[PDB]
């Protein structure tokens, strides 16, 4: 605003450009530099001259272009708007990039709000009176952005407290209209439904709170093996094209929660294309009617041929929107497409910055920084007077070379992680269903899981544990059969095997392309484990009555048949059908005993 | 005890066909992968160790004016 | 024209007495024995420039030479007269003939499509070929890449795909390719030069061809020259663009070699840091644009070294382009047709292509129960060579002869034998028939009854 | 005070035209948003100094930024009301409670134990469990590693060691968190609050969520506090360190970030005078009858020991606790390795007057049946299913046999030394009598019931 503090450019190279005669710069703060006026972030600083990593595209720039300090850090607009808005890694709506520039491409340069400021909401005040003091995180007011979501809260801007003073009657207004007015100690403040907050913080909340809430997964595997609660941190590392776009999207349409955070860094450009195309065709069954998949979730882009900084802006910018999200007192999700780019972003940045590479390639900050956004997600009470619980799960996709877990993304990860969800690449690439192993993936949550998944009066635990023993005493059983044959096991281990065979086939083989497999409900997974250890004891039982194990799956075929078509099964309604089908197991036993 | 000899000859087979495509091929796989694993190691190390030479070479050159 | 030149190291330049430097400027050097090379800017800090030579420093000297900066940065000189005629690595003319007239001077960088404007792949296309039918589809206007090993079938293989591929295609207006080759052998470049002609393309075709005799930085510049001329035959000409591009491995050996050269801090396998988004700079420019005819369709080709599926170069290909197709050389030496492993060689999206509407909707289904049968065939194969033939069941056997026959018969064709999607269909339909009824899982009742004879 | 600066590289910053400079000074510094921070000077020279923030420079403007320098060491305000409280990284309170009144002021550094005034103790702590009092032999006074694995419950088994610890002189427990998770630090103070021994304890919470810069302050706080104890208190005190891999991977950072020689894992030249002081922070003294005993916790990268961090904390500290990770994805009670394990204070604490004259024996027996098992295993592994004749297989028999219940004895039961002697006693009596060479004529004779 005419303030005109202004540095020189000095050395460029790359992304990198080192600006001169600039002493009022900040480090990691928003400057516009060049003669397009392109934002980046000061790093480091020697002498007068001070580094500066350009979150954009450098080419084009010369020398003696003048760069302009904000004398602010990186920010983001938080409020209503945001929703089924795609944003690029300045957090600028990408339809109306594309509207403006009348280009397919991607320019260079360009300024643009966050949100629309043409665009209109009908706000009215959240239960707040007019005198009553008010402080940051207090919701000021209300507005109905979707038919689902409804009531987006308008929050009181940060390092704000003291009483309501003029307060504007409700009604259609946007966002950058100020809807209240508050005299405090720092006498007179406007107020708005839209509070602008800094990336490089996470939003506030009240107090850390332990979550006995589980989210449901969607999926059986992810149900039972490593389990993943609401505020939890669950890794997703897989191989490059294992399914891990795929995985997160699946994760991003079953997912029970809220709303939905999907960041793509660094991936195809045809996926978030796809994401896009296939948005408006999701539709949500559930209460709040004619609702799609896209006004439920909001989507932030960094393209593979954009800037390196560019995901980890956009890495942060989601992680800052979700910590909004958890601050509206709902359950959300963020989801991070290959994380491993954002670290090769931070491998090319310290290296290009002359520090002295650690592993494979990367900084020794990278640990602290992935610690920080495992941390940073959570289950907790939010701010303001309404005390609502807010949850923010943290999902991220990890691309390490060659499948390897030695790779400095895999164990950063799954150190600061409590569940981790590996994916193989070998039943992915029999055109098998989702990919995990069983003898890997674990989580140290499942006990708290547990203790959720008892609220129904089901026992997770007790199938999962056995479910577990009899993969590990298969495993033993494969490695003996590999070993000397499958002719020198006995009875059980025969039968460990078949239903070792069972369990993979019927069960943790699912069409995602299906009708019916493609999701998996919580009674449904339940009932389906329930009759597999039922027909598990049955076999066994029968087993110690002096029976051989070809003749008792002789006659088991039937049953075999049943407890393979309980994949398809139906909807909501009819699904005793599927628990009557366990007394079909239990008369089995009886026509075994004649 | 000619047809317990050739039980015992089937498991000599079945053994020498499990060091012939299994032992030795997932000892030859797991000693390329460790070697990979140390040359790259190696290699890093020797890496960071040519950029400290670089560094210090480039901070006696800068002295040296 | 600056004339002043300060020091001399290596495969690289630094000049002074300049100013307002542009990053990848187009720069004329001009050497003391008259040699005119064209370069790129690098870096500039202060009042100082530092540049690399493309044609090498050798035989330069320092005061007699002289530097004439255009301040643009890399430009060229895109038309539509490319078409029929073959160019080289340079820019300059390999077809002998005269000068170029050109329509548009563009950057060969190439400019990354919106997300919002970013149209998902659709439609189908026929490749002539049953596994890039059944086993993947492919998709027209999606990206694809091909592993192959040294000493493989992969120029005969790329030679079959393209001239079967407009082939084919027309029983789904003909389709337009562009061949680009960076660092190749002259050997591959003839058989390459003889295919293209044998398939009568090269008239509808460009032509990239950059030596391996030639320098890295050309052949490195070759492959954005392309991009460009793709891009504007994708968006300026609207029509469809295929893209074919070989020799990636030579490209990549010479970028860690100019990483190394300039001593910068080099990324896995001694490779770049910025290699990812290096590969992902042409990886992510192909795809489809919303409101724009046509579509740009890639289908790369790289060689894994020492036939090594855990070399660097393909997970990094992997890890950059969206699904790809294996050529395993376990298959190669079998004197069978085309070496393919089905397990290995997967796409992006298989579904756009399949379903009611375009094709079938028994095609997926079949994909899945193929795949399926094929990799128990492959396990108790496995299994077979172990403990034995008599120690497997009738299901290892089934499987395993079902996966020879798949083999055999499936999965060999020939180079210029083009299998229609319908023939390839049937066969696939002949292949199921040779398992049992309840050896496919993956397969539906109708669709069982309806291809079992 | 200076408010003049002259260039900053990232954590680290430097000024110039700087008089009367103290190397590794206490300082305090107010930033430009009215956010006042601590920092540490890392060296000085000429008229310039150079100058770490343990906070973070993060958000700071050169101009409006003033840093005083109190020009002498850092020093804590060392307390015996800070029982039962809590404080941060920074020292200010997290329990949500007032300032408490400091006894003593000086260095948190601490001081370096003479080498004549130093005792080497004997005394046997009962660890309660049946893997662990017997195996390795707990003694306060020594010193003890543990390294675990990335999603391992290392956490559970310190806190259920913790609870089993606490003959009339109680031991008090101090705790030192680098880097540790929000989830680590929740479910460690829910164990905490389960055990009841939370207002005998205190300790310095560093989360993840804070800077881990400052975390490496705080241990050498906790290290402070734990000779303040020793030293003048007289009590027995307990020092444990959480997650020291990120105290070493942050000290590896401060390390690069001054450009200097690197080492292994990017770990810094000095470090091994670093980690020795942080083993320091253990042993006794000489007419004092407190005993202060560092126990300090790291976790393997990639599930190695072949680590750096690893290596020099099995070569400096004397013995290691090593958790296998398929003992854990076993379902078992907690998965310490009798192999990599070992104690070189269990000579001593063993033996008649302490706890058994079987206790030796027993020991070196059990180690000589785990590794015959071991060697059985792979013999299982490479030969039959047939067990390699008689003795591999009562090897292996034995060997299941002391996974499954002496490996294991669960982590709320806390077993006593004589109980875990029975039990070793019973589970030996599958092996034949002169099946054991470990075991000398009185041993074998010792106990026939």
């Given at each position: 605003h005419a303030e005109s503090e202004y540095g020189a450019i000095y050395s460029v190279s790359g992304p990198v450009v080192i600006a001169e005669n600039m002493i009022g710069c900040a480090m990691y703060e928003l400057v516009k530099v060049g003669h397009d006026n392109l934002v980046g972030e000061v790093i480091r600083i020697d002498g007068d001259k001070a580094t500066i990593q350009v979150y954009e595209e450098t080419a084009g720039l010369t020398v003696g272009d003048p760069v302009l300090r904000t004398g602010k850090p990186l920010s983001v607009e938080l409020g209503p708007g945001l929703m089924e808005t795609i944003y690029d890694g300045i957090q600028r709506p990408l339809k109306a990039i594309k509207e403006e520039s009348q280009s397919i491409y991607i320019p260079r340069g360009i300024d643009t709000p966050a949100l629309d400021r043409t665009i209109k909401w009908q706000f009215t005040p959240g239960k707040f009176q007019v005198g009553d003091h008010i402080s940051g995180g207090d919701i000021y007011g209300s507005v109905f952005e979707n038919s689902l979501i409804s009531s987006h809260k308008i929050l009181l801007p940060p390092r704000s407290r003291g009483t309501i003073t003029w307060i504007a009657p409700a009604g259609e207004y946007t966002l950058d209209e100020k809807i209240l007015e508050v005299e405090f100690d720092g006498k007179k403040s406007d107020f708005?439904?839209?509070?602008?907050?800094?990336?490089?913080?996470?939003?506030?909340?009240?107090?850390?709170?332990?979550?006995?809430?589980?989210?449901?997964?969607?999926?059986?595997?992810?149900?039972?093996?490593?389990?993943?609660?609401?505020?939890?941190?669950?890794?997703?590392?897989?191989?490059?094209?294992?399914?891990?776009?795929?995985?997160?999207?699946?994760?991003?349409?079953?997912?029970?929660?809220?709303?939905?955070?999907?960041?793509?860094?660094?991936?195809?450009?045809?996926?978030?294309?796809?994401?896009?195309?296939?948005?408006?065709?999701?539709?949500?069954?559930?209460?709040?009617?004619?609702?799609?998949?896209?006004?439920?979730?909001?989507?932030?882009?960094?393209?593979?041929?954009?800037?390196?900084?560019?995901?980890?802006?956009?890495?942060?910018?989601?992680?800052?929107?979700?910590?909004?999200?958890?601050?509206?007192?709902?359950?959300?999700?963020?989801?991070?497409?290959?994380?491993?780019?954002?670290?090769?972003?931070?491998?090319?940045?310290?290296?290009?910055?002359?520090?002295?590479?650690?592993?494979?390639?990367?900084?020794?900050?990278?640990?602290?920084?992935?610690?920080?956004?495992?941390?940073?997600?959570?289950?907790?009470?939010?701010?303001?007077?309404?005390?609502?619980?807010?949850?923010?799960?943290?999902?991220?996709?990890?691309?390490?070379?060659?499948?390897?877990?030695?790779?400095?993304?895999?164990?950063?990860?799954?150190?600061?992680?409590?569940?981790?969800?590996?994916?193989?690449?070998?039943?992915?690439?029999?055109?098998?269903?989702?990919?995990?192993?069983?003898?890997?993936?674990?989580?140290?949550?499942?006990?708290?899981?547990?203790?959720?998944?008892?609220?129904?009066?089901?026992?997770?635990?007790?199938?999962?544990?056995?479910?577990?023993?009899?993969?590990?005493?298969?495993?033993?059983?494969?490695?003996?059969?590999?070993?000397?044959?499958?002719?020198?096991?006995?009875?059980?281990?025969?039968?460990?095997?078949?239903?070792?065979?069972?369990?993979?086939?019927?069960?943790?083989?699912?069409?995602?392309?299906?009708?019916?497999?493609?999701?998996?409900?919580?009674?449904?997974?339940?009932?389906?484990?329930?009759?597999?250890?039922?027909?598990?004891?049955?076999?066994?039982?029968?087993?110690?009555?002096?029976?051989?194990?070809?003749?008792?799956?002789?006659?088991?075929?039937?049953?075999?048949?049943?407890?393979?078509?309980?994949?398809?099964?139906?909807?909501?309604?009819?699904?005793?059908?599927?628990?009557?089908?366990?007394?079909?197991?239990?008369?089995?036993?009886?026509?075994?005993?004649? | 005890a000619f047809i317990i000899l050739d039980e015992v000859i089937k498991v000599t087979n079945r053994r020498v066909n499990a060091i012939e495509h299994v032992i030795i091929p997932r000892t030859e796989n797991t000693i390329a992968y460790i070697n990979s694993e140390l040359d790259e190691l190696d290699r890093e190390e020797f890496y960071r160790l040519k950029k400290v030479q670089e560094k210090k070479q480039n901070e006696t050159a800068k002295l040296d004016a | 024209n600056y004339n002043t030149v300060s020091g001399v190291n290596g495969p690289l330049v630094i000049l002074e007495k300049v100013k307002f430097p542009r990053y990848n400027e187009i720069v004329n050097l001009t050497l003391p024995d008259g040699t005119v090379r064209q370069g790129q800017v690098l870096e500039i800090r202060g009042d100082r420039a530092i540049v690399q030579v493309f044609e090498g420093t050798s035989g330069i000297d320092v005061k007699k030479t002289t530097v004439e900066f255009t301040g643009e940065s890399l430009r060229i000189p895109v038309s539509e007269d490319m078409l029929g005629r073959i160019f080289d690595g340079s820019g300059r003319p390999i077809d002998n003939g005269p000068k170029v007239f050109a329509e548009d001077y563009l950057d060969i960088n190439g400019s990354p499509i919106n997300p919002y404007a970013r149209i998902y792949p659709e439609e189908m296309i026929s490749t002539g070929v049953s596994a890039i039918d059944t086993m993947n589809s492919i998709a027209r206007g999606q990206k694809i890449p091909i592993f192959s090993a040294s000493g493989l079938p992969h120029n005969e293989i790329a030679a079959q795909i393209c001239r079967q591929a407009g082939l084919v295609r027309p029983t789904k207006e003909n389709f337009s390719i562009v061949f680009a080759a960076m660092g190749v052998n002259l050997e591959t470049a003839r058989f390459f030069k003889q295919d293209f002609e044998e398939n009568g393309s090269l008239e509808r075709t460009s032509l990239f061809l950059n030596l391996a005799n030639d320098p890295t930085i050309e052949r490195i510049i070759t492959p954005r020259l392309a991009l460009t001329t793709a891009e504007y035959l994708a968006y300026q000409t609207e029509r469809h663009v295929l893209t074919i591009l070989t020799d990636m491995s030579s490209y990549a050996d010479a970028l860690r070699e100019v990483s190394a050269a300039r001593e910068e801090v080099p990324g896995r396998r001694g490779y770049p840091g910025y290699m990812y988004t290096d590969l992902s700079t042409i990886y992510e420019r192909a795809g489809r644009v919303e409101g724009r005819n046509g579509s740009i369709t890639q289908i790369p080709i790289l060689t894994m070294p020492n036939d090594d599926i855990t070399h660097p170069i393909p997970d990094l290909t992997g890890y950059i382009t969206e699904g790809q197709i294996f050529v395993d050389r376990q298959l190669h030496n079998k004197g069978i047709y085309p070496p393919i492993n089905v397990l290995p060689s997967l796409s992006r999206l298989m579904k756009s292509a399949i379903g009611e509407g375009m094709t079938r909707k028994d095609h997926g289904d079949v994909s899945n129960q193929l795949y399926a049968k094929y990799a128990i065939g492959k396990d108790a194969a496995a299994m077979k060579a172990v403990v034995g033939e008599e120690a497997l069941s009738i299901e290892d056997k089934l499987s395993l002869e079902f996966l020879e026959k798949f083999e055999k018969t499936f999965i060999t064709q020939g180079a210029y034998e083009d299998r229609t999607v319908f023939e390839s269909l049937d066969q696939a339909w002949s292949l199921l028939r040779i398992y049992p009824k309840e050896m496919l899982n993956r397969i539906s009742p109708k669709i069982l009854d309806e291809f079992y004879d």
């Open positions: 708005t439904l839209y509070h602008t907050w800094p990336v490089r913080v996470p939003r506030p909340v009240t107090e850390k709170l332990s979550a006995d809430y589980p989210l449901l997964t969607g999926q059986r595997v992810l149900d039972a093996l490593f389990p993943c609660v609401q505020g939890g941190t669950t890794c997703i590392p897989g191989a490059f094209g294992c399914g891990k776009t795929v995985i997160s999207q699946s994760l991003s349409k079953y997912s029970n929660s809220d709303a939905i955070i999907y960041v793509g860094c660094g991936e195809r450009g045809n996926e978030m294309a796809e994401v896009l195309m296939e948005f408006p065709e999701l539709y949500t069954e559930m209460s709040g009617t004619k609702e799609p998949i896209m006004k439920r979730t909001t989507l932030v882009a960094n393209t593979s041929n954009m800037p390196v900084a560019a995901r980890e802006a956009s890495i942060y910018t989601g992680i800052t929107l979700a910590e909004y999200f958890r601050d509206q007192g709902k359950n959300v999700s963020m989801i991070a497409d290959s994380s491993s780019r954002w670290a090769e972003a931070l491998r090319e940045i310290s290296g290009r910055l002359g520090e002295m590479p650690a592993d494979q390639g990367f900084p020794a900050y990278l640990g602290a920084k992935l610690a920080s956004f495992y941390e940073r997600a959570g289950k907790a009470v939010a701010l303001g007077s309404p005390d609502r619980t807010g949850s923010v799960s943290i999902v991220a996709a990890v691309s390490p070379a060659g499948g390897d877990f030695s790779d400095p993304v895999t164990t950063a990860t799954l150190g600061i992680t409590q569940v981790f969800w590996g994916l193989d690449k070998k039943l992915a690439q029999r055109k098998h269903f989702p990919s995990i192993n069983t003898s890997v993936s674990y989580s140290k949550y499942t006990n708290v899981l547990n203790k959720f998944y008892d609220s129904n009066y089901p026992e997770f635990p007790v199938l999962r544990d056995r479910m577990k023993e009899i993969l590990s005493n298969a495993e033993e059983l494969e490695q003996v059969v590999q070993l000397v044959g499958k002719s020198a096991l006995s009875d059980s281990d025969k039968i460990t095997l078949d239903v070792a065979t069972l369990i993979k086939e019927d069960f943790l083989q699912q069409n995602g392309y299906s009708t019916y497999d493609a999701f998996c409900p919580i009674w449904k997974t339940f009932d389906m484990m329930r009759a597999f250890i039922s027909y598990h004891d049955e076999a066994q039982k029968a087993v110690a009555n002096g029976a051989n194990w070809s003749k008792l799956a002789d006659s088991t075929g039937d049953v075999k048949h049943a407890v393979s078509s309980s994949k398809f099964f139906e909807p909501s309604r009819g699904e005793k059908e599927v628990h009557g089908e366990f007394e079909k197991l239990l008369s089995t036993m009886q026509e075994r005993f004649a | - | -």
